[PDB]
Write a protein that binds this ligand. Structure first.
Ligand SMILES: O=C(O)[C@H]1O[C@H](OP(=O)(O)OP(=O)(O)OC[C@H]2O[C@@H](n3ccc(=O)[nH]c3=O)[C@H](O)[C@@H]2O)[C@H](O)[C@@H](O)[C@@H]1O
Ligand SMILES: O=C(O)[C@H]1O[C@H](OP(=O)(O)OP(=O)(O)OC[C@H]2O[C@@H](n3ccc(=O)[nH]c3=O)[C@H](O)[C@@H]2O)[C@H](O)[C@@H](O)[C@@H]1O
Ligand SMILES: O=C(O)[C@H]1O[C@H](OP(=O)(O)OP(=O)(O)OC[C@H]2O[C@@H](n3ccc(=O)[nH]c3=O)[C@H](O)[C@@H]2O)[C@H](O)[C@@H](O)[C@@H]1O
Ligand SMILES: O=C(O)[C@H]1O[C@H](OP(=O)(O)OP(=O)(O)OC[C@H]2O[C@@H](n3ccc(=O)[nH]c3=O)[C@H](O)[C@@H]2O)[C@H](O)[C@@H](O)[C@@H]1O
Lengths: 455, 448, 451, 453
């Protein structure tokens, strides 16, 4: 059992801190946003993460988990200091809060600290974190040493508590000098309870660990863009992208996962990380061709639903009504960041249509961000409504558009719907239904990468 | 037990036919190259495929496997006719020619199986050709089926008998559903544990084959770009591989950066898919990038070498370990070694190449490659022993990671080369092992 | 989308019915217990299964899931009829299964596919087939059917996850023409579970029936195997946990279910192991390994008392023991065959006072332990249940751990130090690292490790 | 790079020594059998291990691998001393291990790390420690050492692959100062095996010693487990192979080592399972599951004869049986504890003639069966060996398959039909699919499945 400090209280820090406490460590979770800290200390949780509330509560009442804004108390407490603060897009990749945390650790250090970069940060960030802390130690005459370590984060939004407790792997990057080898043993000790069956931890140098995180997200992004290009080609060949998915996923060298063509990828991670890796690379004088292509295919894909709609109803959608099913960038979250629904709704509104959107969870967040998106077009927002019931969105719709494959959308009341829409047309950005089931249900179906039914 | 005909006697047809026989079918293997057929009938095997000779022999002597050039007897024999001929962007002549013959001499209901890798919609052309030759005859029904091939060169017999999956594409009309049942019957012995077979429409089966090879190609090019980025960040591409392969969504396989991909399949298929797409008015951005990264990567060894010894390599000698496009084959098609050796030769160097298996094939293709430069060829030799290549070398270059190169006699070598320098296009050795062995190591995507 | 009927509303039927609905099927869930039906139709859930309430609710409001006691309506509804009723030892009581089978035969319209989901002895599907064919003969029936075996692989307390993301789905069918028809229907029904890897596994019905037993029997064998080695480790002075990692790292053996402790319990392993032994004796064969496995477990359930008696004496009058964990495993409230019951009885019989704690099974335990010990009112007066783990430790001579619920993994050893009489812990689950206990000043008695 | 000595030149020592050299260590391989040493120094290899010859050659010519009978030179050379000598019979014979230990103590210079590689009984490392500390007392020795357990997990005939790409490496060390020093040395030694996943697993020495036996005992249990269920399947009319797929698909159970058949043999499982049972009775505990496991195997080795006698009668005089497979498993020539030996004995004793075939073990089988049957010269005259699988079938009343060598998987059933007396096959390894046999006109008797006629 060790004393750990986590700096930052978002998905990464909140989950990491709570869960490391849950295995018997004494965790101090620090943040500067006093309201966030106040809310946590009053039994609330600022993020939609199944499991997280009960774990936080359990460990607070047990004396293992504390929330505060006391910077000095935080650095005093932990021998291991996790940097888990955010990294906002710039112009790409804003290191200010990370370096600020690093500075404070250097400013008030007593003895040997292990400083862990948990937040997703660009290769070499750990050297800047080391330079910042070594300096604040020079302004103090410090014969106290430290090592910076890379321990990236692999949590999926809305599945973060499971992903943390039952990880595929744990990546640790350490220097092989003497401080580094000391920090390494401490990480070994810290993560022991995760290595009791298969050995889940994976050791490397810090620059490799930093890199790994980006490459991992970049490959997952490539897989998706890959299938999306092929899906648009399938429409031309008359093939079925879903048959092809089973077809190539059955080769264990490729695997079955993340090959789901649709209306593109969004969220707080892929687009940021892909972009950041492309920039870093251009800055080192290298042009990532494949990743550049991957990023371009996605920007295009986010426009595919509008294209299909415009191709079917015309350039001018004045007088049309579209039901939108699903707003969040993926199911089981309320995160609207980079969500395909936002680009879709904008295009449609701009061409004169009325939109009735439904999402089991993201209604509020969507209303907020889409209002900001469209600030310069008040008159568009007047043609956008949110409804409380999936079927209600369909009232007088020329078509229903599915953009996030939430479970409730998989088995709808097609008869109740038949009584509501103007025409039984569905555009499907996630391939939820089997075309010929749609055909027999009398529905004009427009999937992505498969043949439709159109009757 | 059914009677099958296989048309074509290269890797795909030879292995397919022999192996389908070995499970009790009566296989007629047809080809027009009489010499090939003569060789097979005299116990020889025109391809380097472990296992294949014994399987062919076993089944010939058992009366289940026959080789001939008799077109009509072939068509007469098989109720299922596999088209397994070659496809030299994307030349359909031999496939259509086989299709015609089947139409020309058909008796009853045939199931025609496109096994050879062919572009989406090829099965409709094969259907049109055969229906026509049936109209010149007042004709009996048939269905064209897609059943792609997933054999790795040099491991083809294993890959056929214990497949990951079997892909079958059929129409859902009544001929098509009849062909389907026949395929079900034919492949029954492969479905006795897990159900290995996967049914779909024919255009999707055709597509699957290309997408699969294109995804594999992407994974490689992907890691190669990252490898060249690692060199700049000072990261270790191999650590990264472990780092991202441990995510089961990504997987551990085909993430080996190096000097690029080669051979008779990836380059052809990736190019073919790009063309077909442009022809349908779509530009595959990712795949084009993937193809461009590989053309570049095959030049990476030369670049590192020129960066270290200069633009003019006159008076240098390089040892080349590995010629074949990958280990455990003798196939020199699209092999990185060919681009490397050309570049080096063109800048004045002497080359001594070694490969456990491909020496003859390499000598042949490299002579053709460099026909216009006789004087280059005079500076190229092949040797019989890996260490001999090293005699007076300024450096040793590893381009194919055959097993014997994994544990070399670094002392014997030390007695032979001019300077202990190794460029490594496959990342065989651990850098610090090389450092302690006194060796100047240039890996791909790692610190040296 | 098909119309399915599920007969029985316990773990197997409730979860199976709700979850098959959730993928778009129209499910009629039938049971005779009107109170159970009434509770379900009023938004309640008679079992502790995470996920299950929301899935039931979701699908009721969507018109895909219905609960009733109307036998005839149930048979009329489903073309596929799941028998998921219970099978109470005896050894192995088929009455409710046969009774369900009869009703199906009694009111059948057209071709039915009858699916034995409940765990039933090899050849049960022939008895189900005989029962239904007869009721059809009392009716002059030119309607056909096939009986199918589709065993269940749900873990209590993880049943909803286990159903939706299964290792494999086992289907056993005849290869006559009715059977091959039922097979296609099962293929159709289970399609959505085969979209990545092919999860479904076809075989004959007797082999399917058998598989279920052999699967539980092999898991039981692994545990009893490690338990015997654990008691051997105490003699060699080795560490059973080191050995577990030692042999678990061979992929032929694997890492799971090798956790020695105070034995196995619950509503499945003991029943199924016993059943398979009986069936075998009835077929003139003595399963030696399984018999040994069963005997090792009966012994292991006494190990905690033995260790305790060896330390404090044959007469425990004047001693007090804290009991942490009552349920047969963590994350359930099921007290069936729970080691804690044999432990608590032994200890009470020798004069001790017991204070037991469990985060979930308090009520269930109080109920079953009262029945266990009905002949011994005076024993029960020496048994209390407490609401807070630490409270159990008040004046305890030792703390005994019998179910490794997560909250027990990181306890307040100082708070405890202020409460117990002596810092002694007997550990039936190996929760703690011995030398951590040593430095914490604690006299630790694990199973199969040095203390 | 370290200097290592390996004591003993059998599978364990030969492979270990050669392969540790192959990663750059300087290996001295010691043995007392001068002929064995002579054969190795002349490019020969006393064991059937694919890959081994080339590795040995490679490393000899490179100056990293040496074979000798010079005891003192051996002790002088290695700072790490692997005990890899044999452990024969009585249960579990420690004499050669203790003798090696003594020599190490007799001639030690500085700090040695002594590694018990050979499979030895729990607490053997204390006896090795006692023996060496004593020989140091007869010499007045400051010099310290630590005994370490590093068990072996090689499969016979696959030993080179299994060594170089291991599932895990098990190391047991004391946690005193000598022990922690030996631990670091082992960490250093095995580093090149930990560059991807960390393959090495540290524990105390008694647990390491135990691990080795439990691992074999669990593998043995799985097999006997399936064999009992196989015999129960015959009664229920179920298919044991369907059950295998049925329970293998549960990742908690896994797919491996669930092949019912005519039992387990070889130089390891029976020895180790027996040893574990004895040690246990000696510590006053009766291993019930293991005892049953051992009992089920002894019985299974008799199943083929039982099925044959049930079919043709108590008296097999005038019958002839083809035997396909002799080695205890495929890809080896090891006849130890092979099921074929118990089968052939039974059959011969009832008057039958036997024609046996094996692609590799013919010589070794002739030798051991002759010794098994020394007291029955007349039996051996009714036993022949043949060079071609099909020749065994000449006039056979039946063909019996006991080792599932690959060549048996696709036989010339027509060629055979022209040779045997009746088309009858008893299959102790379940090679063929029953209904394929049925259509081929063959009376098939598999283990734990329904047959034909
Ligand atoms: O860096 C991070 O923090 C995390 O980023 C991602 O997680 P996240 O963005 O929350 O969720 P994903 O499940 O990756 O969703 C990505 C987007 O791709 C889309 N997608 C996903 C899969 C697919 O097959 N097709 C597809 O379009 C999803 O709808 C979603 O919009 C990764 O999945 C995590 O492993 C990583 O730790
Ligand atoms: O279409 C076909 O008939 C076959 O082509 C390919 O196989 P192949 O070209 O024989 O050889 P691979 O083993 O795929 O290797 C191709 C190239 O990839 C390179 N490679 C592979 C993996 C890797 O990580 N890095 C890498 O550079 C190899 O050096 C090699 O030159 C596919 O792997 C087969 O599944 C397929 O059936
Ligand atoms: O037939 C059934 O319905 C189910 O029965 C069991 O599930 P369950 O009864 O919930 O309990 P398990 O999780 O199997 O645990 C069995 C007992 O063995 C004990 N055990 C388990 C694992 C172990 O390593 N050691 C050990 O002592 C557990 O504490 C528990 O008391 C099986 O695990 C399921 O696979 C099966 O579907
Ligand atoms: O202690 C040792 O030296 C070695 O002993 C065994 O290896 P081995 O003796 O070569 O034989 P195995 O391949 O393990 O099989 C042994 C016997 O079990 C039989 N077997 C195996 C698996 C199965 O499902 N059924 C079965 O009958 C084999 O046919 C053979 O008779 C162990 O597999 C290795 O872990 C260990 O390193």
């Amino acid at each position: 059992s060790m004393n750990l400090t986590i700096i930052g209280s978002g998905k990464v820090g909140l989950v990491t801190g709570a869960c490391l406490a849950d295995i018997g460590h004494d965790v101090f979770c620090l943040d500067v946003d006093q309201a966030k800290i106040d809310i946590l200390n009053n039994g609330g949780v600022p993020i939609h993460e199944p499991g997280l509330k009960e774990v936080i509560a359990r460990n607070r009442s047990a004396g293992r988990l504390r929330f505060s804004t006391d910077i000095e108390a935080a650095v005093a407490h932990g021998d291991v200091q996790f940097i888990a603060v955010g990294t906002p897009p710039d112009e790409s990749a804003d290191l200010q809060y990370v370096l600020a945390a690093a500075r404070n650790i250097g400013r008030y250090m007593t003895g040997f600290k292990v400083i862990v970069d948990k937040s997703t940060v660009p290769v070499g960030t750990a050297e800047r974190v080391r330079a910042a802390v070594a300096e604040e130690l020079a302004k103090r005459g410090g014969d106290q040493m430290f090592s910076v370590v890379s321990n990236p984060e692999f949590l999926k939004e809305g599945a973060a508590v499971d992903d943390f407790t039952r990880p595929d792997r744990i990546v640790i990057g350490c220097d092989d000098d003497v401080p580094g080898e000391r920090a390494r043993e401490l990480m070994k000790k810290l993560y022991a309870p995760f290595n009791r069956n298969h050995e889940r931890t994976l050791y490397m140098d810090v620059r490799s660990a930093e890199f790994t995180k980006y490459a991992a997200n970049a490959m997952l992004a490539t897989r998706i863009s890959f299938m999306n290009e092929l899906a648009n080609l399938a429409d031309r060949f008359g093939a079925d992208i879903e048959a092809v998915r089973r077809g190539i996923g059955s080769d264990p060298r490729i695997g079955y996962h993340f090959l789901y063509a649709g209306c593109g990828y969004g969220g707080s991670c892929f687009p940021k990380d892909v972009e950041a890796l492309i920039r870093t690379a251009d800055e080192h004088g290298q042009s990532l061709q494949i990743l550049k292509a991957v990023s371009s295919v996605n920007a295009t894909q986010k426009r595919v639903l509008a294209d299909k709609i415009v191709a079917r109803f015309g350039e001018d959608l004045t007088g049309r009504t579209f039901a939108i099913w699903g707003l969040a960038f993926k199911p089981n979250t309320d995160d609207m960041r980079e969500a395909p629904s936002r680009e879709l709704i904008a295009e449609l509104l701009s061409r004169g249509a009325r939109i009735a959107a439904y999402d089991p969870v993201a209604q509020e967040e969507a209303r907020r961000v889409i209002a900001l998106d469209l600030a310069d077009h008040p008159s568009w927002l007047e043609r956008l409504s949110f409804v409380d019931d999936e079927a209600q969105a369909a009232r007088d719709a020329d078509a229903l558009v599915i953009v996030t494959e939430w479970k409730i959308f998989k088995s709808p009341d097609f008869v109740a719907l038949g009584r509501l829409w103007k025409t039984p047309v569905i555009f499907d950005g996630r391939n939820l239904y089997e075309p010929e089931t749609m055909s027999e249900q009398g529905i004009e179906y427009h999937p992505i990468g498969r043949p439709g039914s159109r009757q």
